[model samples]
Target: HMKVDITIKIQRDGQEIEIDIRVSTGKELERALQELEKALARAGARNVQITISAENDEQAKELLELIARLLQKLGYKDINVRVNGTEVKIEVRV
Candidate 1:
């Protein structure tokens, strides 16, 4: 069947953005985050929240780390992550 379905929601008002994405399968997590990363590179945001869905706790943690590193790698500062069941939320400011 389908591994994961992802939906990314990003709300940006100049430097402020909110990013939301949902993933059902494992692999989709990485791909979606990559897309999110690309989106941030083009501009700067004041308050940004990035959300992602995972299959389980492990995947949630994985995505959290994945996004965290992604932000750091891209020179984004002030970041935090939260995992609720299969949902992963990341907030970063740049």
Candidate 2:
């Protein structure tokens, strides 16, 4: 298994939150992110920008999709996904 050092930067409603973690398992990262996502949803952010950095495109894409689905569930609109090698960016408006 490969360990990836990931930095996730999220900005919403002029407020920014950042999470940096070294993950070797999908469950670990998803659990941590879901917690943050729920908090942000409760805060009713106007928009969200999620920046992801991993060791490979595969890891980044999987993480992006995970967050994208969560954002959609929260009724966030205008979802956009961008891929740049090991980095992925997701933007959505709530």
Candidate 3:
């Protein structure tokens, strides 16, 4: 099983929130982000960024793709994915 560490940040109007979690599957990642979205929306967030890192770079890429697809499906705007070694960073801006 591939486990990835995720760091999520949300910012809006000078307010920000951060979360750290671990997910091992695409489904878990989707659920986690959905929950985060709701929380951020309640907080009036305007932007979201996530960094996912794994011990293995391949695993990071796999999870990154999954997250990108999931967020796109959810109609997130300005979704972007970037890779730096073993870390994959994703940003979604409203």
Evaluated with TM-score, which candidate comes out highest? 2
Let me know the TM-score candidate 3 reaches against the reference structure.
0.69
lDDT digits (tens) for residues 1-94 of candidate 3: 4557878887667777788888666677667867865665566555778788766866776778876765666567788777788888888887
Across residues 1-94, which tens digit of lDDT does each residue of candidate 2 receive? 3646555566665668776777676577767777877776776666666766667667676777777777777887688887777777787865
Worst-scoring 10-residue span by lDDT in model 3: 37-46
The RMSD of every model to the true structure, in order and in angstroms, is: 3.6, 2.8, 3.4
Pick the lDDT winner.
3
Off by over 4 Å in 1: 1-11, 14-32
The lDDT per prediction is 0.61, 0.70, 0.74
Better of 2 and 3 by lDDT: 3
Pairs of residues clashing in candidate 2: none
Backbone Cα, N, C clashes tallied per candidate: 3, 0, 0
lDDT of 2 at 49: 68
